[PDB]
């Protein structure tokens, strides 16, 4: 079990530096659009201020701005060349629990890639430094890249958030509720354990989904919704979901010893789809 | 967080290499395609023999990503556990590159491929027993590991086999830890826990740094019998030691008492030690 990101090449070819007056950060060049975070101008008063000569766009790794809009927390620039390296793409929101890949960029230059999970408090625990705004998070299905996160800000140490390409910011933060354990990913990780001969924590005892979801409201766990991915894990291991929901209720109380895939606490950052693909 | 280099560069150089009924990945730089030598093996073999049996067209090289399609093999040599295949088209997308061998504790990025197609990228550290903890399935041999200083790619790994651990070749042909294409006990990476501690100090968890200090030379001989690696300090560590004020010898003592166990305490809310982040990592991310 490894934190595994999509290869970053397709996205790499779309990362541009967008600049406006003093501030500069990362932009996403798709077709004739350049997406970027709007605080590049620091709002409706600020938009009237600018002209197309207020934005310069550079590709590092020759563009003129001939259009300007704002859409939510995002600037929708238009440019005179369609990116010849534009992947087949989509805009979509990620619901909490789900994982996506991040291309961390600075001054329009990609420098790192890693995977994060969209936390239940609508933040993400990645590694972002000053000027990484405009880095893009994405997943990939078949051949269609699917862009789901533009980076914008850092709330406290290590907690970051950002927007979907519809301009909406995750968790409505303007340019934090308590975190919870993603119950369905914990379930996946527990199945991953069983599939690697580490099954000391399984009992015949069971907790119904409804009982667990009530218990979850009281202990900062997410509502469990079963999926085909989880069901396939159930079949292969022989161990029912509800057994795992019981073991969670007990393991949270403490590991009393005793390890699971090298960890002393619960892991909620690997998804069912993650586990299936890797095991 | 575990953080791999962008892969677009390397993605441009991945090909599929076919020989008989066997297919895996190769790396395409200049006129040379490197691939693991067991692509020659039908379902203990004698590689020098099979390499003789190789005819002008026993090798086929497809490139799937970017602009297709097929490359003609023009000559074939063996080197170590790899094949050096020469092709008449030079890779236009070849970058500046070197062939470095990583040492244990060092971290490199892997690009996992299947039939020439990149499918995922992650980061491993090379284990003290010369294995890596990857995610690799059938047909992933040929997947390459690399680091990038400047815009220079340091290719350091070609994936060969599964032992649940993994190993492969340096690009000079030599398998890591001298495994054969037909496991000693792991140890804790002393310098990487030093680096991990330093990230704890830098983050507000500083309780373990008693003013007592164990020297390098003595921690080392201690390590030889408690499954730690010989500590070798580096300028990267020293930056992490000036920024905190805590001396290396302090944490070397702290490892000696923390190995016994955490006595009901948390560092980074970890009960065991983490040896999978490097001083370079800490320096970059904190």
The Cα–Cα gap between A35 and A22 comes to 18
Which chain A residues are closer than 8 Å to B123 by Cβ? 3
The Cα–Cα gap between A204 and B23 comes to 45
Q: Which residue of A has its CA nearest to B9?
A: A9
**What's phi and psi for A275, nearest 5 deg?**
-60, -50
Residues in chain A: 279
Q: Is B48 exposed, middle or buried (0-12, 13-18, 19+ CB in 10 A)?
A: exposed
The 8-class DSSP code of residue A250 comes to H
Name the token pair of B169. Answer: 């070749």
Record: contact B6-A125, CB cut-off 8 A: no
Q: Which residue of B has its CA nearest to A85?
A: B66
Interface of A with B (CB under 8 A): 1-10, 12-13, 103-104, 110-114, 116, 125-127, 157, 196, 259, 262, 264-265, 278
Strands (E), chain B: 14-19, 22-29, 32-36, 59-62, 70-71, 73-79, 82-87, 97-99, 107-114, 117-125, 144-149, 152-162, 166-169
Resolution of the model in angstroms: 2.8
Tell whether the torsion through CA atoms of B225, B255, B156 and B13 is positive or negative. positive
Which chain A residues are closer than 8 Å to B271 by Cβ? 264
H helix or E strand, kind and range, residue A109? strand A109-117
H helix or E strand, kind and range, residue A57? strand A56-58
Name the token pair of B75. Answer: 């000559």
Which chain B residues are closer than 8 Å to A5 by Cβ? 4, 120-122
Q: Of B118, B121, B285, which is closest to A113 when you measure between CB atoms? A: B121
The Cα–Cα gap between A56 and B189 comes to 47
Q: At what angle do helices A183-195 and A228-237 cross, to 10 degrees?
A: 30
What region, left, alpha or beta, does residue B130 occupy, with left being phi > 0 and alpha being psi -120 to 50 degrees? left
Name the token pair of B31. Answer: 């006129």
Which chain A residues are closer than 8 Å to B164 by Cβ? 196
The Cα–Cα gap between B40 and B141 comes to 13
Q: What is the dihedral of CA B126, B129, B131, B132, to 10 degrees?
A: -40
The Cα–Cα gap between B7 and A113 comes to 9
Record: contact B285-A127, CB cut-off 8 A: yes
Pairing of strands A109-117, A99-106: antiparallel
H helix or E strand, kind and range, residue A25? strand A23-30
Record: contact B121-A8, CB cut-off 8 A: yes
Record: contact A110-B4, CB cut-off 8 A: no
The gap between the terminal CA atoms of chain A, to the nearest Å, is 8
The Cα–Cα gap between B46 and B130 comes to 25
Record: contact B4-A114, CB cut-off 8 A: yes
Residue A222 · residue A209 · CB < 8 Å: no
Name the token pair of A24. Answer: 């500069």
Is the peptide bond preceding residue B69 cis, with omega within 30 degrees of 0?
Answer: yes
Please note each residue after which chain B is broken, C-to-N distance over 2.5 A, or write none: 43, 163, 182
Residue A8 · residue B6 · CB < 8 Å: yes
Record: contact B285-A4, CB cut-off 8 A: no
Which chain B residues are closer than 8 Å to A7 by Cβ? 7-8, 11, 111, 118-121
Q: Of B7, B122, B133, which is closest to A9 when you measure between CB atoms? A: B7
Record: contact A110-B8, CB cut-off 8 A: yes
Residue A117's nearest CA partner among A91, A97, A137 is A97
User: Helix H segments across A6-80?
Assistant: 9-12, 44-49
């Amino acid at each position: 079990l490894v934190k595994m990101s999509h290869p970053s090449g397709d996205v790499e070819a779309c990362m541009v530096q967008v600049t406006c007056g003093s501030m500069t950060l990362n932009g996403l060049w798709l077709d004739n659009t350049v997406w970027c975070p709007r605080h590049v101008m620091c709002y409706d008063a600020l938009l009237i201020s600018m002209t197309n000569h207020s934005f310069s766009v550079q590709k590092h790794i020759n563009l003129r701005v001939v259009g300007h809009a704002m859409q939510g927390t995002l600037l929708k620039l238009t440019v005179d060349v369609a990116n010849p390296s534009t992947p087949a793409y989509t805009f979509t929101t990620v619901k909490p629990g789900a994982a996506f890949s991040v291309l961390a960029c600075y001054n329009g230059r990609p420098t790192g890639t890693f995977t994060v999970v969209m936390r239940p408090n609508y933040t993400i625990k990645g590694s972002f430094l000053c000027g990484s705004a405009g880095s893009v998070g994405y997943t990939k299905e078949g051949s269609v890249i699917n862009f789901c996160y533009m980076h914008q800000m850092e709330l406290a140490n290590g907690t970051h958030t950002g927007s979907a390409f519809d301009g909406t910011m995750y968790g409505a933060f303007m340019d934090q509720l308590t975190d919870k354990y993603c119950s369905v990913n914990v379930v996946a990780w527990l199945y991953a354990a069983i599939l690697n001969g580490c099954a000391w924590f399984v009992k015949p005892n069971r907790t119904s989904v409804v009982s667990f979801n009530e218990w979850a409201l009281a202990n900062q766990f997410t509502e469990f919704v079963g999926t085909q991915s989880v069901d396939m894990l159930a079949v292969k291991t022989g161990v029912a979901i509800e057994q795992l929901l019981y073991a969670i209720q007990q393991l949270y109380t403490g590991f009393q010893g005793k390890q699971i895939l090298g960890s002393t606490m619960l892991e909620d950052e690997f998804t069912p789809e993650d586990v299936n693909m890797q095991i």
